[PDB]
RNA sequence: AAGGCGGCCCCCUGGACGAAGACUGACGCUCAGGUGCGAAAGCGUGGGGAGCAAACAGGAUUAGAUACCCUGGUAGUCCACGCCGUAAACGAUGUCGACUUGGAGGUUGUGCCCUUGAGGCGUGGCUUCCGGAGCUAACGCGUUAAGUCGACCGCCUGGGGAGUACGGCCGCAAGGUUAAAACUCAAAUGAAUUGACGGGGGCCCGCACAAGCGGUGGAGCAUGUGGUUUAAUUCGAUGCAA
RNA sequence: GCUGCAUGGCUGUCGUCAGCUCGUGUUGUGAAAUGUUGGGUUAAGUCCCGCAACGAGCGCAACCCUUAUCCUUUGUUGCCA
């Protein structure tokens with residue numbers, strides 16, 4: 001998040017590095033998470049839904065690879 | 071009045087209003103501006119244009135101090151935490167540093183209950 | 188527009204000089220389905236400039252066109268709920284189209300003895316670049332400079 | 344594609360005193376990288392987490408990017 | 411074991427699994443009563459109290475709003491020691507044992523192979539996903555069975571009444587546990603199918619928007635409707651579709 | 653004279669939107685499903701490929717009218733090289 005201006009660095013690329021570092025640290029995401037209190041049931045349920053969807057998309061990738069269309 | 075030529079701007083952009091405050095190195099506030107002060111009401115303050123208009127008015131309120139080099143400390147998740155940057159840049163300041171100063175708790179204290187709108 | 192993409196429409200070129208631009212200019216100047224009078228005034232305007240500037244009036248209208256043709260535009264959009272005037276580069280088929288349109292209403296607000304005379308003065312004053320057309324083009328340039336702050340908004 | 348680094352050389356615990364192979368698993372913001380991206384084995388990532396926590400306790404390594 | 415357990419360190423301590431042996435010699439499984447543990451909320455006494463937040467107050471919203479939204483806010487949440495013994499305490503799936511085709515992972519051991527190596531072959535424990543036979547009303551389960559079987563325990567007998575009354579036991583209370591009957595209906599119910607609907611979603615099309623031109627809404631008049639008036643102001647057509 | 657909320661006939665509407673079905677076969681204990689889904693494409697359930705589906709029908713399209721070109725036939729009341 002802390003960025004220093006190097007030599008031959010215009011404001012354009014300076015702000016781009018700022019923004020890119022913002023996602024990499026993820027700071028905006030974690031602020032939105034703590035914006036509201038979430039129940040242990042709720043994080044467990046959301047993570048379980050996330051896990052099943054990642055896994056479902058995972059094997060759907062191989063099934064689409066192994067199937068033949070037209 | 072007192073000419074020092076170097077300061078730091080602070081951009082606290084909440085989800086509803088953004089506030090810009092240029093201060094000296096050790097934190098004595100030189101000037102400030104805000105979206106509500108710029109003359110907007112309701113969601114108009116939240117819009118990044120409000121943040122855009124607030125940055126010129128906060129630079130042209132410190133312009134009597136002769137400041138040209140300044141850092142920027144960006145805090146808050148609200149929209150307009152990118153608009154004020156180039157707004158200040160356009161006003162004519164040689165941006166020295168950019169630093170994200172948003173407070174991320176290491177999961178201490180309890181947030182308010184979810185809004186059931 | 189939504190399903191099948193199509194190209195531009197071909198317009199019969201200018202008969203007296205062989206240009207496509209003069210025909211399109213006079214067509215957009217045409218109002219209320221009157222091209223007969225439109226042809227008369229466009230010929231009169233070009234010949235006044237022919238006697239004023241060099242004999243080849245082709246280049247005089249060309250230079251009066253280029254100094255007012257816009258290469259950057261202002262487009263209103265809403266992505267996240269805020270009004271964005273995104274500036275975009277415009278392709279030349281629209282560049283010259285928007286330039287001559289503005290000239291059309293620029294002449295109307297001139298308010299000279301006749302419509303033919305005011306077009307002639309407008310096209311001449313654009314050649315020296317002191318014209319209200321250049322005024323409008325400097326006006327769009329300042330707001331375009333202003334929109335460079337919007338230039339990095341959503342849907343760049 | 345990616346293979347764990349500490350599997351190549353026999354390591355009995357991750358040493359907290361080390362700063363080599365600790366600074367690289369910390370990111371620019373001071374956070375510590377997941378096994379997902381750094382391609383390391385779950386056997387050592389628990390030890391790596393413990394090692395980083397010990398090091399930042401003793402101020403060899405920083406908690407955050409600022410301090 | 412379940413409830414549950416998340417900074418790092420130290421002290422005390424339980425279980426699990428793997429390798430190669432040694433040893434005891436059926437010492438085993440299950441379990442009515444009984445005992446112990448048992449989220450959150452709650453109760454007692456004494457602390458503590460930043461954040462959050464029942465109650466309560468005010469402001470909005472609304473026909474009303476004892477709510478949803480906002481600003482505040484006490485109990486409680488935190489600690490010590492007792493009590494409570496209830497949860498969608500769920501895998502809605504008792505414990506123990508044996509047998510029955512496979513495949514990909516995760517996690518933790520362990521024997522080997524030119525150990526060359528940032529390489530493979532075996533063997534265990536635990537754990538997710540898919541699926542075969544089979545089973546199932548179907549959905550589905552499928553070696554971690556809801557398959558094939560044995561041991562024992564718990565429980566069920568139409569929907570309401572009702573997990574209520576009374577009695578007993580436990581509790582400071584809140585209440586918990588055991589647990590009916592009269593009366594009433596011809597259903598209640600599970601899974602799945604076709605539609606219809608959703609203030610559900612994804613994609614595609616249309617002058618639907620966008621890009622343009624010209625308008626209406628401003629003026630006058632014509633015309634229809636509403637309203638009003640009158641003896642009647644004939645009757646029908648009222649979202650787009652008057 | 654009343655009831656279109658008893659009706660026939662007729663009409664508006666989504667909307668000329670592209671859908672609505674059947675036979676045989678197969679699947680399911682069965683209601684039913686499949687066909688009709690999917691990759692594209694089209695103005696279109698239009699077409700193609702795949703596909704336990706193979707075909708078929710009503711709709712789409714085509715046939716009807718007009719306009720855009722030419723040839724032949726008759727020339728007045730129409731035409732004049």
Ligand SMILES: [Mg+2]
Nearest residue numbers: 450451452487
């Ligand atoms: Mg408690």
Ligand SMILES: [Mg+2]
Nearest residue numbers: 452453454486
């Ligand atoms: Mg208490």
Ligand SMILES: [Mg+2]
Nearest residue numbers: 182183463480
């Ligand atoms: Mg509240």
Ligand SMILES: [Mg+2]
Nearest residue numbers: 413449499500
């Ligand atoms: Mg539980």
Ligand SMILES: [Mg+2]
Nearest residue numbers: 495496497499
């Ligand atoms: Mg119970």
Ligand SMILES: [Mg+2]
Nearest residue numbers: 498499500502
């Ligand atoms: Mg149960």
Ligand SMILES: [Mg+2]
Nearest residue numbers: 439440441505
């Ligand atoms: Mg037992």
Ligand SMILES: [Mg+2]
Nearest residue numbers: 540541551552
């Ligand atoms: Mg299965």
Ligand SMILES: [Mg+2]
Nearest residue numbers: 573574586587
């Ligand atoms: Mg009771």
Ligand SMILES: [Mg+2]
Nearest residue numbers: 626627628629
């Ligand atoms: Mg009017």
Ligand SMILES: [Mg+2]
Nearest residue numbers: 656657658659
């Ligand atoms: Mg009717």
Ligand SMILES: [Mg+2]
Nearest residue numbers: 675676677686
């Ligand atoms: Mg059939």
Ligand SMILES: [Mg+2]
Nearest residue numbers: 678679680681
């Ligand atoms: Mg059959």
Ligand SMILES: [Mg+2]
Nearest residue numbers: 671672688697
């Ligand atoms: Mg259909």
Ligand SMILES: [Mg+2]
Nearest residue numbers: 685686687688
């Ligand atoms: Mg069907």
Ligand SMILES: [Mg+2]
Nearest residue numbers: 685686688689
């Ligand atoms: Mg179907």
